[PDB]
């Protein structure tokens, strides 16, 4: 029978008896309802509006099987020491999402449940992908294990640099700075996230001179060198056109900003990278607009998960100690989530769901953002071996130049890796290893004296 | 101020001062304590382009002590003085090389 | 001379004596610094890190001209009734940005200034584009004036419907519901933002049956009919492929989600639509993640300006009265900014900069989100004549069906337009016109009785 | 419940009951009070595909009263009884028509 | 004999087109019955109109970096005669 | 798109810019070339031309190379021209 | 700059294999575009009629126009508006 | 190591195509490096049969094109599991 009118959201959307299926997408929401609204109604409205939900009863509902396709809330868990704050668990059937599309899974769940009059704040904490849905995606073009085989580099973390200033340098001067860094002993160099194709330096000029700088540096040292060329462009055609020219110059690696350009563009490029055998570095520009606040937005672990499915060989995870925000317990959570095949559920770490990847390759973690020679033993112990450490100002800001600055970082890293392998704690003897290595190398001794006093210590907004 | 001299480098642990026999023994001991398979590789010339080196005998699957590995290095060194020699460590679970370092350079 | 070390951000980035040029990009930031941090340092760090900034002094800065390319803070204004809260004004030179690219301007300004350790919250309130920069962009594919000429519809706001439920219906049952809505008296029908290409209904089947439904409804009524076909796809190739098939079936209009797919994909489609003469409808899914909170994020008026430059003929502006959040003063602010050629600076309205568009076409406003027949005279008075009013649940939730539901909405609009043209206030006599029109039409009399008690009234989180 | 009858519609104001001569006078008065130019158009057949109607004389640029517009409608009606007749309002600043409504339908 | 200064609005010209700005201004004002002679002395392009064009493909600064030639003016030569030589003979004179 | 330098020959200029009473002065044709695209442009030789006509040549030569050109009536320039970081064109002196 | 009175002259000079264009002549009629176009068509058809019949269009040019204006009200108004409008100046390019 | 010792050819197993643990384009690149080293060391022509058997006809020809790009002498295919239509297509390509 058909009854026209206004139905309560709690009636046929909140079911506590329901048990989640193995082929089901699960989401964890942190909800803050308006005063005078029940916990169940707030959870039901999020579950309804995201999938098959409408403010009034419609007759067309009876033609379809509503019970099969509806999203439902199965559990409500209240937040300790907080009034009008609860964790909602919502199940979504597998059949309603498009295959191999991050855009669909994003537009469906976090489409318009945010900005609802009935609730003041909402935050998506963690999402669970089943094995059946993961198999439709390509994933990373190469992954950790394939990348190390192509680069022929084993035993240590990789070293990188960012050219400064961000804007102003000529195409010829840019290549000179690239050459001097790679000559010293760094594996990679990087373009800034904002560098694309400005009036002062055009992209095709930058690509040509950088290629000459690598060619000289590789033949001199006897080691494979690279540079992440920024492919981010106004249109999908211009993006692919810049990538083609990097392939023509025989470049091993290119970079892209996934959030500002969007997931549609990032999926296109990652598929292209697979077909042409090019490694793909991913910058997380504009992330902190979304993931900063503890009450509203989407946590980064969800954005990290979505990138692994879309495609990417490297990802910025952020330094624990440095100029930008980071929390050790939270960071080690999503870093182990991108690198490992199987991750166990851990509430203190921040992981709400047991995530299982079906033989999908891991993504290399990038630690960057205001780090010098003293932070080296702390970074190595936290991030491990399968990571990239990048020094922008730490390399170029050396009193003697780029090449002695690049040697200073390389000596500091290899001295710590050697000490770790011997059987020494880097948390206890971190200062000692750096100090004893600075006796036989003059470049390290100068760099240690300069950035001794500098320490970034501030309160973090996002907490467990 | 000082200008950096031009020098050819050999991947991992090539920036540190040359490894003593005690230091190499400690690096091999690390490989065995974790549970990885040690192996000896040799080549005529060291280049960034080439990624395969000639395998000396077979990977040591049945290694009990680090002295056994050092004995295989000494055998390859006496047989080939004018060749580069490196020690590599294979992992079976992850299916990737954990450690790689050069122990011998062509003598004069 | 070169000096190595750490320089204070306040020294060469905060200049109060500077006066902004006409060929300059201006931004207004609402800054909340950490305890023990001065107002000037917090303002200078945002200005520095967004453009040509680094944590330590580098030698490569002396090769370039730093004074020409640097972004500077010229005015600091404190927020009334607030401790550690201020408005910062930052000027950026024209030459550092890429021509005709929203991606670059977004990645440059709001790249990584958020998530800084030295500040707890940051918000971008308004952005100014100079005339010289606007000329590089294409803008909207058609605009308000050309759209009305192609559709042949003058005098009134346009009417639309969204098919419910969102997910579950077959391709054939979708087209049947599309047909019944257009037969009644609606101008447009619309796909839900989450409908793309699911297992239960594939896109190519939906596209075919909807085309048959329009053809029958156009011939029956004698008016031009249309339907927004959701083109949003996992890749740039798939997106352009779906648009080509809509062009093949002689379809006047298609829709796209700009934020979830990204600006790169949207700019690609907006150029395509210009070259084929297809109208483009823009859904603002995932907006409320960014623009909800008053302390953190990016305000929607910046995103509205960014869409007008990128391309789009329609944009969702949100209802003042409805199920989703909206403020009358704030709404009318950016609504008059998307349509008009010249907008004067108004602080009470929320506009921080005087905006001028160089003969660039206006974007039509779309009002949607839980509206019924009683909200009709309020929406007509606020949004005006050049707007689209869309009824999802309001049309299909009628007790008699879709065809009487559409006729009820059509009568109610044309009664309001007629009463306005005579010289009657719709704020004072809003209830009177609806009630007197329900005497000669049975369809309106049923619809008025059902949704009399329903009203959405809650406190807004975003305030001036 | 009631089934909606099939009827051919004519864009704006077609859903309201047929307009009286008093009601037409008020709608034309709206055009003049805003400052728009009123014009009369006629056509043999009403179709959604066609977007041009034959113009009656010229747009009335110098209209003082709504009576002058109604006089032009009556002259076109007496001349063409079997033609559709509509009244339009041109805006010169925005360069787009503001109002368009049908006053006459072909007599039987 | 007088100089006449004429202003034109930006919106009437096509973006990134020299062909249009030439056809519009110096179209058919020349060859008028009311005036014996006409000459265009100068033109001013606003910043907003300049940004539409690509401009030179490289420019002075980029060119010198590609050629690796700094400090002095560049030296050129034109092969004589203009018309007559073979392709093999032309290349020998170039060498 | 291909990274090739472009040299521009000003053939047939003298048909338009010769007579002081009729046509289009070369400075207008030089401005149009900077907007359309070209890495080198022919400017003409400076040998004689008295003292007055030498100033005109240096007028449009500075107008092709500099970013900002101030208004100067004696030199020949009627308007203050401002290029928005648009690259300069190298002058060819030949004849 | 041509109207209905220049019609008998244009037929005589250019003959048959020619196109005659009226910009301001069609759109400048007091009645509109449609009566303006009919005034131009009627005038041309009458001039062709008199030519084929064997009448001199240089001497009897005004007579054919006035006869055609008698049975066409659209032409009669156009002849009343433009009649004194004639362009007569000295030509620079001559034999 | 097999080609070094003194074998003429090496072969992929019939079931090897493009599994999650090793992708086809990776296998093609590393095997090409092995042939180049062994050929130069022994002084004899060496080869490896690369498995081009694919889910679709487009995917088959795509894998074959890359083998030609790496200058490979020999490729392999399964004719009964893929079918006669797919095999004839590849045989004509190989010619
Ligand atoms: O622009 C910058 O700020 C950086 O180049 C750091 O510069 P320095 O190396 O000179 O400090 C990096 O892009 C950030 O680390 C990105 O942040 P995250 O890794 O958190 O995304
Ligand atoms: O999915 C929905 O909720 C809607 O279809 C409304 O449905 P009803 O008309 O059936 O309520 C619209 O997409 C939202 O209004 C979008 O928000 P905004 O307009 O703010 O972008
Ligand atoms: O712009 C104009 O003036 C015209 O459209 C005529 O308009 P009117 O009929 O309204 O004058 C023509 O383009 C010129 O006469 C062509 O000149 P020419 O014949 O020398 O090529
Ligand atoms: Mg950077
Ligand atoms: Mg919807
Ligand atoms: Mg086999």
PDB file of C-alpha atoms in Angstrom, chain A residues 100-265:
ATOM      1  CA  UNK A 100      37.114   1.363 -10.445  1.00  0.00           C
ATOM      2  CA  UNK A 101      35.755   4.819  -9.565  1.00  0.00           C
ATOM      3  CA  UNK A 102      36.906   6.856  -6.546  1.00  0.00           C
ATOM      4  CA  UNK A 103      34.693   9.735  -7.764  1.00  0.00           C
ATOM      5  CA  UNK A 104      31.524   7.606  -7.274  1.00  0.00           C
ATOM      6  CA  UNK A 105      32.467   6.292  -3.783  1.00  0.00           C
ATOM      7  CA  UNK A 106      33.273   9.896  -2.740  1.00  0.00           C
ATOM      8  CA  UNK A 107      30.190  11.623  -4.276  1.00  0.00           C
ATOM      9  CA  UNK A 108      27.827   8.997  -2.784  1.00  0.00           C
ATOM     10  CA  UNK A 109      29.017   8.925   0.857  1.00  0.00           C
ATOM     11  CA  UNK A 110      30.320  12.483   1.518  1.00  0.00           C
ATOM     12  CA  UNK A 111      28.091  14.187  -1.093  1.00  0.00           C
ATOM     13  CA  UNK A 112      25.582  16.295   0.865  1.00  0.00           C
ATOM     14  CA  UNK A 113      25.205  14.762   4.382  1.00  0.00           C
ATOM     15  CA  UNK A 114      27.571  17.543   5.491  1.00  0.00           C
ATOM     16  CA  UNK A 115      25.782  20.906   5.654  1.00  0.00           C
ATOM     17  CA  UNK A 116      22.598  19.416   7.092  1.00  0.00           C
ATOM     18  CA  UNK A 117      20.500  21.722   9.317  1.00  0.00           C
ATOM     19  CA  UNK A 118      19.949  18.976  11.936  1.00  0.00           C
ATOM     20  CA  UNK A 119      23.671  18.565  12.809  1.00  0.00           C
ATOM     21  CA  UNK A 120      26.333  21.206  13.555  1.00  0.00           C
ATOM     22  CA  UNK A 121      29.451  19.140  12.709  1.00  0.00           C
ATOM     23  CA  UNK A 122      30.383  15.873  10.963  1.00  0.00           C
ATOM     24  CA  UNK A 123      33.686  14.020  10.436  1.00  0.00           C
ATOM     25  CA  UNK A 124      34.448  10.891   8.397  1.00  0.00           C
ATOM     26  CA  UNK A 125      37.110   9.079  10.431  1.00  0.00           C
ATOM     27  CA  UNK A 126      37.687   5.737   8.658  1.00  0.00           C
ATOM     28  CA  UNK A 127      36.360   3.759   5.676  1.00  0.00           C
ATOM     29  CA  UNK A 128      36.506   0.021   4.851  1.00  0.00           C
ATOM     30  CA  UNK A 129      36.892  -1.394   1.342  1.00  0.00           C
ATOM     31  CA  UNK A 130      36.062  -5.097   0.757  1.00  0.00           C
ATOM     32  CA  UNK A 131      38.335  -7.393  -1.315  1.00  0.00           C
ATOM     33  CA  UNK A 132      35.676  -7.624  -4.086  1.00  0.00           C
ATOM     34  CA  UNK A 133      35.713  -3.824  -4.625  1.00  0.00           C
ATOM     35  CA  UNK A 134      39.533  -3.394  -4.414  1.00  0.00           C
ATOM     36  CA  UNK A 135      40.002  -5.899  -7.300  1.00  0.00           C
ATOM     37  CA  UNK A 136      38.290  -3.553  -9.813  1.00  0.00           C
ATOM     38  CA  UNK A 137      40.975  -0.854  -9.313  1.00  0.00           C
ATOM     39  CA  UNK A 138      44.420  -0.730 -10.963  1.00  0.00           C
ATOM     40  CA  UNK A 139      46.200   0.510  -7.823  1.00  0.00           C
ATOM     41  CA  UNK A 140      49.764   1.935  -7.963  1.00  0.00           C
ATOM     42  CA  UNK A 141      51.516   1.743 -11.396  1.00  0.00           C
ATOM     43  CA  UNK A 142      54.619   0.042  -9.927  1.00  0.00           C
ATOM     44  CA  UNK A 143      54.728   0.010  -6.096  1.00  0.00           C
ATOM     45  CA  UNK A 144      57.642  -0.251  -3.623  1.00  0.00           C
ATOM     46  CA  UNK A 145      59.203  -3.564  -4.749  1.00  0.00           C
ATOM     47  CA  UNK A 146      59.216  -2.878  -8.526  1.00  0.00           C
ATOM     48  CA  UNK A 147      60.513   0.714  -8.050  1.00  0.00           C
ATOM     49  CA  UNK A 148      63.636  -0.401  -6.135  1.00  0.00           C
ATOM     50  CA  UNK A 149      64.439  -2.924  -8.891  1.00  0.00           C
ATOM     51  CA  UNK A 150      64.248  -0.255 -11.638  1.00  0.00           C
ATOM     52  CA  UNK A 151      66.250   2.326  -9.628  1.00  0.00           C
ATOM     53  CA  UNK A 152      68.761  -0.351  -8.440  1.00  0.00           C
ATOM     54  CA  UNK A 153      68.827   1.051  -4.870  1.00  0.00           C
ATOM     55  CA  UNK A 154      68.662  -1.158  -1.741  1.00  0.00           C
ATOM     56  CA  UNK A 155      69.487  -0.946   1.984  1.00  0.00           C
ATOM     57  CA  UNK A 156      68.615   2.664   2.844  1.00  0.00           C
ATOM     58  CA  UNK A 157      65.916   5.379   2.585  1.00  0.00           C
ATOM     59  CA  UNK A 158      66.053   7.584  -0.538  1.00  0.00           C
ATOM     60  CA  UNK A 159      67.166  11.244  -0.472  1.00  0.00           C
ATOM     61  CA  UNK A 160      65.535  14.233  -2.178  1.00  0.00           C
ATOM     62  CA  UNK A 161      65.601  18.030  -2.473  1.00  0.00           C
ATOM     63  CA  UNK A 162      63.243  20.891  -3.358  1.00  0.00           C
ATOM     64  CA  UNK A 163      64.536  23.882  -5.387  1.00  0.00           C
ATOM     65  CA  UNK A 164      64.226  27.284  -3.640  1.00  0.00           C
ATOM     66  CA  UNK A 165      62.922  29.887  -4.138  1.00  0.00           C
ATOM     67  CA  UNK A 166      59.558  28.435  -5.240  1.00  0.00           C
ATOM     68  CA  UNK A 167      59.062  31.116  -7.918  1.00  0.00           C
ATOM     69  CA  UNK A 168      61.453  33.523  -9.673  1.00  0.00           C
ATOM     70  CA  UNK A 169      64.308  31.452 -11.149  1.00  0.00           C
ATOM     71  CA  UNK A 170      65.063  31.199 -14.885  1.00  0.00           C
ATOM     72  CA  UNK A 171      64.935  27.854 -16.733  1.00  0.00           C
ATOM     73  CA  UNK A 172      68.746  27.914 -17.110  1.00  0.00           C
ATOM     74  CA  UNK A 173      69.337  28.834 -13.430  1.00  0.00           C
ATOM     75  CA  UNK A 174      66.843  26.149 -12.339  1.00  0.00           C
ATOM     76  CA  UNK A 175      68.869  23.449 -14.132  1.00  0.00           C
ATOM     77  CA  UNK A 176      72.124  24.698 -12.579  1.00  0.00           C
ATOM     78  CA  UNK A 177      70.672  24.266  -9.062  1.00  0.00           C
ATOM     79  CA  UNK A 178      69.363  20.788 -10.019  1.00  0.00           C
ATOM     80  CA  UNK A 179      72.841  19.709 -11.227  1.00  0.00           C
ATOM     81  CA  UNK A 180      74.690  20.919  -8.094  1.00  0.00           C
ATOM     82  CA  UNK A 181      72.344  18.952  -5.781  1.00  0.00           C
ATOM     83  CA  UNK A 182      72.587  15.615  -7.648  1.00  0.00           C
ATOM     84  CA  UNK A 183      76.388  15.951  -7.954  1.00  0.00           C
ATOM     85  CA  UNK A 184      76.714  16.058  -4.137  1.00  0.00           C
ATOM     86  CA  UNK A 185      74.905  12.769  -3.496  1.00  0.00           C
ATOM     87  CA  UNK A 186      71.103  13.063  -3.538  1.00  0.00           C
ATOM     88  CA  UNK A 187      68.949  10.529  -5.411  1.00  0.00           C
ATOM     89  CA  UNK A 188      66.166  12.907  -6.521  1.00  0.00           C
ATOM     90  CA  UNK A 189      65.291  16.581  -6.963  1.00  0.00           C
ATOM     91  CA  UNK A 190      61.761  18.044  -7.005  1.00  0.00           C
ATOM     92  CA  UNK A 191      59.680  20.853  -8.480  1.00  0.00           C
ATOM     93  CA  UNK A 192      57.491  22.857  -6.069  1.00  0.00           C
ATOM     94  CA  UNK A 193      53.729  22.151  -6.069  1.00  0.00           C
ATOM     95  CA  UNK A 194      52.964  25.645  -7.467  1.00  0.00           C
ATOM     96  CA  UNK A 195      55.439  25.457 -10.411  1.00  0.00           C
ATOM     97  CA  UNK A 196      53.596  24.699 -13.668  1.00  0.00           C
ATOM     98  CA  UNK A 197      54.114  27.112 -16.614  1.00  0.00           C
ATOM     99  CA  UNK A 198      54.588  30.729 -15.474  1.00  0.00           C
ATOM    100  CA  UNK A 199      55.508  33.818 -17.640  1.00  0.00           C
ATOM    101  CA  UNK A 200      59.094  33.926 -16.237  1.00  0.00           C
ATOM    102  CA  UNK A 201      59.814  30.232 -16.987  1.00  0.00           C
ATOM    103  CA  UNK A 202      57.889  28.122 -19.513  1.00  0.00           C
ATOM    104  CA  UNK A 203      57.457  24.382 -18.877  1.00  0.00           C
ATOM    105  CA  UNK A 204      59.117  23.130 -22.097  1.00  0.00           C
ATOM    106  CA  UNK A 205      62.254  25.173 -21.317  1.00  0.00           C
ATOM    107  CA  UNK A 206      62.448  23.757 -17.753  1.00  0.00           C
ATOM    108  CA  UNK A 207      62.054  20.153 -19.016  1.00  0.00           C
ATOM    109  CA  UNK A 208      64.926  20.555 -21.517  1.00  0.00           C
ATOM    110  CA  UNK A 209      67.552  22.052 -19.149  1.00  0.00           C
ATOM    111  CA  UNK A 210      66.784  19.661 -16.245  1.00  0.00           C
ATOM    112  CA  UNK A 211      67.330  16.693 -18.618  1.00  0.00           C
ATOM    113  CA  UNK A 212      70.839  18.054 -19.387  1.00  0.00           C
ATOM    114  CA  UNK A 213      71.552  18.487 -15.652  1.00  0.00           C
ATOM    115  CA  UNK A 214      70.714  14.834 -14.843  1.00  0.00           C
ATOM    116  CA  UNK A 215      72.763  13.521 -17.818  1.00  0.00           C
ATOM    117  CA  UNK A 216      75.927  15.260 -16.521  1.00  0.00           C
ATOM    118  CA  UNK A 217      75.357  14.297 -12.851  1.00  0.00           C
ATOM    119  CA  UNK A 218      74.662  10.597 -13.595  1.00  0.00           C
ATOM    120  CA  UNK A 219      77.821  10.183 -15.723  1.00  0.00           C
ATOM    121  CA  UNK A 220      79.965  11.961 -13.101  1.00  0.00           C
ATOM    122  CA  UNK A 221      78.899  10.054  -9.951  1.00  0.00           C
ATOM    123  CA  UNK A 222      78.103   6.674 -11.567  1.00  0.00           C
ATOM    124  CA  UNK A 223      74.652   6.375  -9.936  1.00  0.00           C
ATOM    125  CA  UNK A 224      71.087   6.658 -11.319  1.00  0.00           C
ATOM    126  CA  UNK A 225      69.676  10.177 -10.819  1.00  0.00           C
ATOM    127  CA  UNK A 226      66.179  11.622 -11.289  1.00  0.00           C
ATOM    128  CA  UNK A 227      63.948  14.692 -11.005  1.00  0.00           C
ATOM    129  CA  UNK A 228      60.167  14.817 -10.436  1.00  0.00           C
ATOM    130  CA  UNK A 229      58.784  16.987 -13.261  1.00  0.00           C
ATOM    131  CA  UNK A 230      55.467  18.710 -12.454  1.00  0.00           C
ATOM    132  CA  UNK A 231      52.834  17.561 -14.952  1.00  0.00           C
ATOM    133  CA  UNK A 232      49.861  19.379 -13.295  1.00  0.00           C
ATOM    134  CA  UNK A 233      48.041  21.355 -16.019  1.00  0.00           C
ATOM    135  CA  UNK A 234      44.774  23.335 -16.734  1.00  0.00           C
ATOM    136  CA  UNK A 235      43.223  20.592 -18.953  1.00  0.00           C
ATOM    137  CA  UNK A 236      43.410  16.785 -19.396  1.00  0.00           C
ATOM    138  CA  UNK A 237      44.966  17.282 -22.870  1.00  0.00           C
ATOM    139  CA  UNK A 238      47.708  19.653 -21.644  1.00  0.00           C
ATOM    140  CA  UNK A 239      48.459  17.230 -18.773  1.00  0.00           C
ATOM    141  CA  UNK A 240      49.046  14.250 -21.113  1.00  0.00           C
ATOM    142  CA  UNK A 241      51.026  16.479 -23.521  1.00  0.00           C
ATOM    143  CA  UNK A 242      53.583  17.371 -20.809  1.00  0.00           C
ATOM    144  CA  UNK A 243      53.872  13.719 -19.732  1.00  0.00           C
ATOM    145  CA  UNK A 244      54.606  12.634 -23.340  1.00  0.00           C
ATOM    146  CA  UNK A 245      57.580  15.023 -23.590  1.00  0.00           C
ATOM    147  CA  UNK A 246      59.061  13.676 -20.329  1.00  0.00           C
ATOM    148  CA  UNK A 247      58.817  10.183 -21.879  1.00  0.00           C
ATOM    149  CA  UNK A 248      60.516  11.528 -25.047  1.00  0.00           C
ATOM    150  CA  UNK A 249      63.485  12.848 -23.006  1.00  0.00           C
ATOM    151  CA  UNK A 250      63.716   9.394 -21.295  1.00  0.00           C
ATOM    152  CA  UNK A 251      62.843  10.584 -17.762  1.00  0.00           C
ATOM    153  CA  UNK A 252      62.194   7.920 -15.074  1.00  0.00           C
ATOM    154  CA  UNK A 253      59.798   9.927 -12.828  1.00  0.00           C
ATOM    155  CA  UNK A 254      57.042  12.624 -12.928  1.00  0.00           C
ATOM    156  CA  UNK A 255      54.922  14.330 -10.212  1.00  0.00           C
ATOM    157  CA  UNK A 256      51.266  15.424  -9.801  1.00  0.00           C
ATOM    158  CA  UNK A 257      48.955  17.156  -7.294  1.00  0.00           C
ATOM    159  CA  UNK A 258      45.921  14.870  -6.855  1.00  0.00           C
ATOM    160  CA  UNK A 259      43.571  16.951  -4.660  1.00  0.00           C
ATOM    161  CA  UNK A 260      43.729  20.296  -6.534  1.00  0.00           C
ATOM    162  CA  UNK A 261      43.514  18.652  -9.982  1.00  0.00           C
ATOM    163  CA  UNK A 262      40.943  16.059  -8.854  1.00  0.00           C
ATOM    164  CA  UNK A 263      40.564  12.278  -8.842  1.00  0.00           C
ATOM    165  CA  UNK A 264      39.339  12.045 -12.473  1.00  0.00           C
ATOM    166  CA  UNK A 265      42.623  13.542 -13.751  1.00  0.00           C
TER     167      UNK A 265
END
